[PDB]
Amino acid sequence: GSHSMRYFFTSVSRPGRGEPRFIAVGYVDDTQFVRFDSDAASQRMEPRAPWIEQEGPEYWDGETRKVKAHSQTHRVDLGTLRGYYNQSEAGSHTVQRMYGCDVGSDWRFLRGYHQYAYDGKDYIALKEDLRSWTAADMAAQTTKHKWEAAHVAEQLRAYLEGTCVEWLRRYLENGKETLQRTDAPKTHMTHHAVSDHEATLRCWALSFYPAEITLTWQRDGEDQTQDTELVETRPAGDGTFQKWAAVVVPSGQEQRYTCHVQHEGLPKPLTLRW
C-alpha cells in the first residue's frame, strides 16, 4: 500500500497578551511521531512513537530549530493576514498549514502537498503539478504573486519530491515493526431489539491499522444503504482504530443480512452473519 508523511501546523492569536499558541504534529501514515506545543515546558520537538527515539541529539536539535522557525513564520502570517483582511487587533484568529509527501507501494514519490487556511477557510494551496497555486480570494492572490516572484513552488517541489520522501523511507525502515505491519480488524456482530417488530444489527471492526476501512451491508447478496448508519472511524488510543456499521431489520429476518469488511490486512474480505 501507499505511505505518507504529513505535518500539521495550527497557530491561534492571543489578543490580550503575548504571542500566538502554536501546535505542530507530524504523522507517518496514521501514526503520530512528533509534536511541538508552544505552551509546553520543554520548547523542544518531542517524540510520540518509539522508532523516532532511535534518532540521536542532532536530529532533535535540527527539528527543534526548524519547528521554532515555522512558529515565527506563522506568527508573522497572522499579522500579515490581519492587514490583508482589515481586521482589528481585538479578535482571535487561526492559521493552519499542512505539507508532506505520498509514496506508492514501491516507495517512489507519488504526490506532494502544501496548503494553507485562515479562520478555517481555504487560503492558498500548491497544485498537484507542484508548479502553480490555487488562491481562493484576492488576499491569497497577493500571496500567490509574491511566492511566484520568489520561486517558492520550486523550493517546495525540491523538498516534497526529494528530501521529504527520503525522510519517509528512513522512518518506514526504522519503524518497520509497526509502520510496515497491518493489523486486520477484529470483527463481531451485536443485536439490539427496540420492539417486537424491529431489530438493529451492528457490525464492529476493532483494533485495526491503518485507519482506512470499508464496512457494507447486503440483504440477500445485494447492497443496502437504506436504514443503515455508519459512524466515523475513531481512534482506540493505542495506535489502532475502531468503526461500526448498523442496519435496521424486521425481527426474524436477521439471517438475510450480511456485513462485509474490506481492509489492507485482510487478504480476502470478511463476511459476518447473525
Binding site: 515555522h70 513564520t73 517558492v152
Partner: peptide, 9 residues
Amino acid sequence: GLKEGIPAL
C-alpha cells in the same frame, strides 16, 4: 523531518 524553512504569506 521538517523542511529547512517555509514561505511566509
